[PDB]
């Protein structure tokens, strides 16, 4: 089920039983990768990048055709962010809610959802600090958190 709610929704991507394909694609992993790096230089995330290449560039997913994942490619080319998008967007969310709270002390629901968010952040941070992709402490502090994500 859902982490911080009773939700039981299951909308997601159903990958096909295939590790190649399309036959109809016929361009190159390399030219695709050139496109990848270009849109990375534009400063997008793997998520919207793959969305773009789905909607426009005939791409199923680079997992198939390149033999690598997006974040791996960006790492190889030196385009990796300092942090992952997960924390990035979560922190944006927390900060926005915090700014809302600053001018609405009485909104209780925002307060509630904030600690939900921060607990997500802390657990996920334990994960990433376990895998050592971060410095071992890093301790998201919501006060300074603004200029981190920004």
């Amino acid at each position: 089920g859902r982490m911080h709610s009773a939700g039981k929704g299951i909308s997601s991507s159903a990958i096909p039983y295939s590790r190649n394909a399309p036959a109809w694609f016929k361009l190159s992993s390399e030219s695709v990768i050139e496109q990848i790096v270009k849109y990375a230089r534009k400063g997008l995330t793997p998520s919207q990048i793959g969305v773009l290449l789905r909607d426009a560039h005939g791409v199923t997913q680079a997992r198939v055709i390149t033999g690598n994942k997006i974040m791996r490619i960006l790492k190889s080319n030196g385009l990796a962010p300092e942090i992952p998008e997960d924390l990035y967007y979560l922190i944006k969310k927390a900060v926005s809610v915090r700014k809302h709270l600053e001018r609405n002390r009485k909104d209780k629901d925002a307060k509630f959802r904030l600690i939900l968010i921060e607990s997500r952040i802390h657990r996920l941070a334990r994960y990433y600090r376990t895998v050592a992709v971060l410095p071992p402490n890093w301790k998201y502090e919501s006060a300074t958190a603004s200029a981190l994500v920004n």
């Binding site: 230089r41 534009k42 400063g43 300074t144 603004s146 200029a147 920004n150």
Partner: protein, 100 residues
């Protein structure tokens, strides 16, 4: 709908060339190197007017940040407040051609 100016600037700050503060803006603007200047909302009106006059002389673009110098510092990723920014090379960004 709205692609945020903040997200644009973060690309310029990692890809492009900027300077911060009135003195360095004015220096680059005397040099004609500046393309755009961003001005905080809480900046004094005399300073704002002075910059506008230098900009209309240099034929340079002016953006008025809907935000003060503290938020503008955070937007460009800084732990201090900044009242004026000068863009001298946009990198992979689009801010020159954007709706700005």
């Amino acid at each position: 709908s709205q692609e945020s100016i903040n997200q644009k600037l973060a690309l310029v700050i990692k890809s492009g060339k900027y300077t911060l503060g009135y003195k360095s803006t004015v220096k680059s603007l005397r040099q004609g190197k500046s393309k755009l200047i961003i001005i905080a909302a809480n900046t004094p009106v005399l300073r704002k007017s002075e910059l506008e006059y230098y900009a209309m002389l240099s034929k340079t673009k002016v953006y008025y940040f809907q935000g003060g110098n503290n938020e503008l510092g955070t937007a460009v990723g800084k732990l201090f407040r900044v009242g004026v920014v000068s863009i001298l090379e946009a990198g992979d960004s689009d801010i020159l051609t954007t709706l700005a």
